[PDB]
From a paper:
[name] is an antiphage defense system of [name] that specifically cleaves invading DNA that are methylated. Furthermore, upon binding of the endonuclease [name], a higher oligomeric form—tetradecamers of 12 [name] and 2 [name] protomers—is formed. GTP hydrolysis by [name] bound to a recognition sequence powers DNA translocation, and convergence of two such complexes on the DNA results in nucleolytic cleavage. Here we present the structure of the [name]+ domain of [name] in complex with [name] at 3.6 Å resolution using cryo-electron microscopy (cryo-EM), which reveals the coupling between the endonuclease and the motor and the mechanism of activation of the [name].
The complex was formed in the presence of the GTP analog 5’-guanylyl imidodiphosphate (GNP). [name]ΔNC is dumbbell shaped with the two hexameric [name]ΔN rings tilted with respect to each other and sandwiching an [name] dimer. Three-dimensional (3D) classification resulted in nine major classes with varying tilt angle, indicative of conformational plasticity. The two protomers of [name] in the [name]ΔNC complex are related to each other by a two-fold symmetry. The dimeric interface mainly constitutes helix H9 and has a total buried surface area of ~3000 Å2. The catalytic residues, Asp244, Asp257, and Lys259, are located close to the dimeric interface and aligned along the FA interface of [name]. A particularly interesting feature of [name]ΔNC is that the [name] stalk blocks the pore of the [name] ring.
Author numbering:
A (entry chain C), E (entry chain B), F (entry chain A): 168 to 457
B (entry chain M): 3 to 21, 28 to 267, 272 to 348
C (entry chain D): 174 to 457
D (entry chain E): 173 to 457
Write the structure that this text describes.
């Protein structure tokens, strides 16, 4: 795989990706935080093939956390084979065994919606091990379910961790500050005001006037949201994904097309962001239409 | 029978708790203001999202969830009827912080004297919290929450809930409640005032350093070095700057509200603070007595026992910003 | 397409939105035939009235990921990994890619949607359907075995708007789901024509719509407490008249105390006078 | 059976009109109203044949769970077997007899979590979704060969009570699927008065008692919040103890007030004994 | 092994280290509480080699508590064998038996992130026996799952216990005051002001003015944290670990590098820390950048 | 077993120990209720030897309760073999049987940290028999796990039960109902202002005035704690055991030795106590240092 293969369709600036790859090679653990709809899940699979340099899914494992996810499933735990229970090497443990086999090649573990599951309980022993300076046999630790002290588990040096955490929910946040230190936090923006976003639209036979009107509209709307940081921070701001998909057939993005999507998706979304002000709902919606 | 306009009191509570438009609401009385803040305040939180704290659950279920506890599993023989005792983390809004809100809202609804619009809106909210369990609130519950794990916003409304619970009295009916006439009693209003300044001064007087200072008597006694019987003396506030120090004693009296004899009993405490206080820098020592008045504000200065002391008043009920201007104007003169 | 009381435009909107987006939420008060819409609609997209393709479930507060997708549960011998319905259902559609298999979820609001769906909360998106986006599941014994939504799957969500929960708001799930409101449709001819084809009086149908709508406007009057999501549905009138009893004021009066009166109580709680007032307005 | 029931005949007509169409129903009333006896006579009334076999009764509690109700795994001599519950076995009994109406009685329904017990079935019991078309495989139905469907013939009656102020608003699950009916104590009814004149009660003693209980029942229901209409006393205490062989009399009533009404009055108010002493004495005379 | 080797690179004052051994050797159970990034994990491995006087791993054992450790895991519990359960001696019991195998040479048990788990549940009987006075065969006790035949378990005198409780998570704080008496609590400071931190940078190609400004700004910032106590207490203040790492290749410290640190990791930390006004965030971020 | 050896070293008044012996012979179910560091565990070992009049381990048994403790271990229960289940006589069942052999000789059972475990889960059926009046063969009961009704278990009159409970946690504000009826609570004072504690300090080369200054502050400080009930009750107050320890070398008490204890034990302890008022910590901590 190569870098420019990714950048063709990617709306994120190159500076961010180089910023991302610079940290990740150093820190070995990163968190991409932004609102939904900016390609977090999209980039993460791409970035892995860049970092490895080869399009190998075998070396990549991609998982989505949720409430009913535990250390027993993730790392190690006792589970029923049948009549008799057995100790089950979890998925992350299995991934680490594979990466050991090929120390040269980078192996990458991608966790979507990380903020949901109780990370302290899930990672546990890993919470110390995962740090860039603490990887290797020197800091090897025996596990909970290890038969004896001799059995010890150490993260390989090659391992890189990428986490995707939406900023839409303040309820679910990485408040565990000790965990925050391990991860290098990389903000990601909606990225309306980019050429690559604009060129994709023009590539789909789109009006340059309508496009420049669109970017100015959303940028102003997003700015209104970020202002009221008490109520809604920048983390809530709308992403570009609503506009991206749905044009695969070849439908031109006319003003009528914009009018439909606003009615179905953004309009009720604005109701939630602005529950108290109905006037504010009509104002921004009609601004797009007018 | 003069008292402060009620809307102004809420601002003093705000600095007291250390953390909006109140012009719109038409109910002057306190509980109308207070409920509207809470009733509107909760609506602000849910927009961002309420706190969900992982409560681990050890329960008997028909299957594996999370970690099975082998001991309780075998001893109770739950394997035989296809069950295990397993530990897992249900995610609820049933936390103590959130439970307190719902119980307080029930009290708010039950209150005999309340605006109809306010009561109707809360009853919706009470319905909107199905999972959370109502509780009979005590300060001991509030005591556990002094840890302050919750966000900064939660702490604001929780302090509000503290005010309501303590200031709730049954009225005509067995079920219903009636709000305490807070303004009338001087002690709690005075104790509010003393706290109001201390947190206020830290905010605005960034130039100066503001801390409450404990003081020790110069006395020695042959009987006891402890001198425990002697009165405990802790300043209301001290607002120290490099050029000049200043001690303040502030209290709320009813007699002073009438525009005659003057109630300045607190002054007797003040000189003794000056005496026990000894400055290493020796820049200066100053004192201030400040009281609340309704109609107008008057400032005097005195040179009593080698100390420069000011007696001053503030016209509460004037306007909150002009009051805020007046307070900064006042301290600026004496802090010199 | 004949007995539906909803405009042809709304269903025309839905089919384009459904085919395009592949996931939708039909949100409205109870009694508007949300279930009948989806059940009717599901057969349309298939093109044939096939019920085996369509599966319906009713979420509830205790519903869990153990039931839906995967889970460890006991066989006769002991515990095993038990493939949940949706995993079984997607396998069923995986068997036949060409035909369209549909999944209907009622009372969705009650359960903590993030908790139940979990892994598929990402995968369900129309773009992320296929082997490329597959992920290993939580309880998957081996990392190599993964789960992916097929392209044929379409999901329809039916939500009661009368119990808003200020517990968890998720704007990310809202990205997957394109939300569609549904009005009761008293004014619509299709509801009227049905009753007029049941030996109703022409004025009586006209009288009914005026009476009920005044209540709905009053319900939607106070946006903070209540809304269009709360307002009354029509389905109560549909049922009970196919025996042969034509509409009459007494028939309405039966429904009023039977059905509407608790709803009013729930909505206009602790205000009996408003209940007696609005109840009595309808009888005249 | 009709005449023996003490409630207005009009309500009896109202209920079957609801149940036959709605197929799910819940009765909420004070304790001591004969809610169990009501449903039984009503259950036999709907069938018309007075068969107890058709009728089966269960009383819910918080421990009550899906394994007891529907299906679960129970220990064998060695190992364990799948053990069919009441409702699973009950419905298949009615499956043979489609025409024949079969009834299920759920007492103290509000205590338990309806969702937890029913599980899957909570939608299938809603009348719109009934019969073979709406089949669902059960949680423990390991194979896909067999599915559980509740047939149309089933009718479900629930006995709930408004006794306790601790109870909050009813669970939302119930409201959707169930029609709520409030049952009056029925003192005023002639059928209860003819049940005491049949025992040679004095009309003054009868007329006084009807006014007397109403006088308390009016007062207890006057309270808006703590004590509502649901609190007011029912008539069942008066039945048991009269047709056993003992005639009505003022002393017979006097014993009963001490027996049940006097402690019950304490529980409801639980604040003022003087208020209790006033009313308890007032009841005697 | 000796103190000069250990204290060669450590940024902690000598004051604590001898103070630690003064408290440790008399009391034998301690807790090192400080925010993350002050070398709590870092020193603890080094301290173990001092007391034994040698660099030996066998006499040392290292573990982390992840809110799922239990008495069944720590001390005595039952594990599935092939068809049926068996009794397994936990790691601590396994460790103590080795520790009393030779009393002369000291044995250390290291428990990272001790604050998390419900320690009363984990230790059980041991909470009494751990204390220095109540050690040896005199205070021998039979365990819960011990055999009916009397066999008793006592903490040997040689054992020393070290705990590492971070001070960020307030909720996860020891309120089992009976247990907090068993341990002696040693505060560890961030370490900016100390020269041994400063000297490390200057040795690695750093300007003193840029260095002294950096420490000057951080200590001002940390006091603002120390000023507050409601949410952000004294303990929350930033550690020195962020600046320690990432310079191994030869990258000199400069405002560009400092700008990378501040934008990438700390600036997210501050907004989570304050979450009231961005201006406080914009102020302090710009101060560090300035 | 002479009292002179027993009671001289002890700090507790001879008044309370005698009363303890009165109720203990009378009622045989006793609870010592006081904060940690007042010698609850220390007295209990001595009192048993006092009552027996002899130093015998067999007649005396000691245990600490915790959440994992259960009926199945305490009294009777089934432990799995490799496949099969074998019944096992528990401790108290095994212990009383020894006491049955020697009914005349007194036997003692000591339960430390009793509140941590629910008594009902452990004792269960035996809480009826455990009571002082309902003992002996007259009140005998057959056990849950007994093969037949014939086998019966009765608490012999000779055994006395001691339970050590600490009033240091908010959970214990709601004392368990089972304890109050069947056990007789005794309050253990902190005991700073005591002759023997002072005489102990003077014996270890301590200045008299320094001792008296110390006690007044602790006695004054403990009064401050006792005044509150909401957060800190009377039971929260400091015990007398921080100062006992650490002088075995012979190092004299002084401000230097005191400073170690305050900073490492009492200073952070106060931080947990007085979270709301940090100044209160400085107010008291500095007061003690002076
Ligand atoms: N074609 C194209 N699509 C993009 C680009 N950026 C984002 N998207 C699209 O937006 C959709 C979602 O990507 P995703 O990473 O899952 O967004 P997200 O923020 O993670 N969503 P969520 O947080 O809800 O999981 C996909 O259609 C993705 O391809 C882009 O640059 N080009
Ligand atoms: N070279 C060097 N590195 C130090 C020094 N002090 C701390 N560090 C580094 O800072 C990083 C983290 O130290 P660590 O012990 O893990 O801190 P911690 O308190 O244990 N972390 P946590 O609280 O999150 O568990 C490591 O790179 C560590 O080596 C030091 O004095 N010299
Ligand atoms: N020499 C001497 N030591 C005492 C005296 N009182 C307590 N101690 C010492 O204090 C230390 C701990 O006593 P202990 O009984 O364990 O307190 P505790 O109540 O059991 N602690 P906890 O409540 O935490 O379990 C021991 O060294 C004990 O001997 C005393 O009067 N004299
Ligand atoms: N003809 C016709 N019947 C309807 C319509 N809406 C609902 N019904 C019938 O009303 C009954 C109950 O519908 P249901 O799904 O339970 O109500 P909902 O889920 O709250 O929307 C079924 O017989 C529906 O088919 C409609 O719009 N037209
Ligand atoms: N004969 C007759 N008995 C009645 C009537 N109503 C109630 N009862 C009697 O009252 C008793 C049942 O009362 P009930 O309230 O269900 O008892 P509870 O469930 O404990 O509250 C039985 O003796 C019933 O026969 C009635 O109308 N006629
Ligand atoms: Mg995504
Ligand atoms: Mg660490
Ligand atoms: Mg002890």
């Amino acid at each position: 795989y190569c870098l420019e293969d990714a950048l063709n369709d990617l709306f994120i600036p190159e500076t961010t990706i180089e910023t991302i790859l610079k940290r990740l090679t150093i820190k070995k653990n990163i968190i991409l935080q932004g609102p939904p709809g900016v390609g977090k899940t999209f980039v993460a699979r791409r970035l892995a093939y860049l970092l490895t340099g080869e399009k190998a899914p075998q070396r990549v494992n991609m998982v989505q956390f949720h409430q009913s996810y535990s250390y027993e499933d993730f790392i190690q735990g006792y589970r029923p084979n049948g009549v008799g229970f057995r100790r089950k090497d979890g998925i992350f443990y299995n991934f680490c065994q594979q990466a050991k086999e090929q120390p040269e090649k980078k192996y990458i573990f991608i966790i979507d919606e990380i903020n949901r599951a109780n990370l302290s309980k899930v990672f546990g022993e890993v919470m110390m091990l995962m740090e860039h300076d603490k990887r290797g046999e020197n800091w090897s630790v025996p596990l909970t379910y290890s038969e004896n002290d001799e059995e010890r588990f150490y993260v390989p040096e090659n391992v890189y961790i990428i986490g995707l955490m939406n900023t839409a929910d303040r309820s679910l946040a990485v408040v565990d500050y000790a965990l925050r230190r391990r991860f290098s936090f990389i903000d990601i923006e909606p990225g309306f005001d980019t050429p690559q976003f604009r060129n994709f639209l023009l590539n789909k036979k789109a009006e340059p006037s309508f496009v420049e009107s669109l970017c100015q509209k959303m940028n102003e709307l997003n700015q209104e949201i970020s202002k009221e940081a008490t109520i809604l921070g920048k983390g809530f701001r709308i992403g570009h994904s609503y506009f991206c998909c749905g044009l695969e057939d070849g439908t031109s993005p006319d003003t009528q097309w914009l009018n439909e999507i606003v009615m179905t998706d953004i309009a009720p979304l604005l109701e939630e962001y602005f529950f108290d002000d109905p006037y504010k709902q009509q104002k921004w919606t009609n601004k797009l239409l007018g | 029978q003069p008292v402060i306009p009620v809307r102004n009191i809420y601002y003093m509570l705000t600095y007291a708790w250390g953390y909006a438009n109140l012009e719109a609401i038409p109910g002057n009385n306190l509980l109308d203001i207070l409920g509207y803040v809470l009733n509107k305040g909760v609506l602000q939180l849910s927009r961002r999202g309420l706190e969900l704290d992982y409560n681990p659950n050890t329960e008997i279920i028909p299957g594996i969830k999370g970690r099975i506890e082998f001991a309780k599993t075998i001893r109770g023989f739950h394997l035989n009827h296809g069950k295990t005792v397993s530990t897992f983390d249900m995610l609820n809004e049933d936390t103590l912080a959130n439970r307190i809100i719902k119980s307080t809202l029930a009290i708010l609804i039950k209150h005999e004297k309340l605006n109809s619009t306010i009561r109707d809106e809360a009853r919706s909210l009470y319905r909107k919290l199905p999972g959370i369990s109502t509780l009979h609130l005590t300060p001991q519950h509030f005591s556990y929450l002094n840890g302050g794990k919750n966000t900064r916003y939660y702490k604001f409304v929780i302090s509000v809930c503290k005010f309501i619970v303590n200031n709730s009295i049954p009225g005509q009916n067995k079920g219903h409640y009636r709000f305490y006439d807070f303004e009338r009693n001087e002690k709690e209003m005075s104790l509010l005032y003393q706290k109001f300044l201390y947190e206020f001064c830290r905010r605005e007087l960034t130039s100066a350093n503001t801390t409450r200072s404990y003081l020790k008597w110069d006395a020695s006694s042959i009987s006891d070095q402890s001198l425990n019987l002697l009165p405990r003396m802790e300043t209301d506030i001290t607002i120290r700057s490099s050029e000049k120090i200043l001690i303040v004693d502030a209290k709320y009296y009813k007699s002073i509200f009438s525009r005659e004899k003057f109630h300045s009993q607190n002054l007797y405490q003040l000189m003794n603070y000056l005496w026990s206080l000894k400055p290493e820098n020796g820049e200066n020592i100053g004192g201030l007595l400040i009281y609340p008045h309704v109609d107008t504000a008057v400032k005097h200065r005195y040179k009593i026992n080698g100390f420069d002391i000011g007696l001053c008043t503030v016209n509460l009920g004037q306007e909150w910003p002009c009051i805020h201007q007046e307070l900064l104007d006042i301290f600026d003169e004496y802090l010199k």
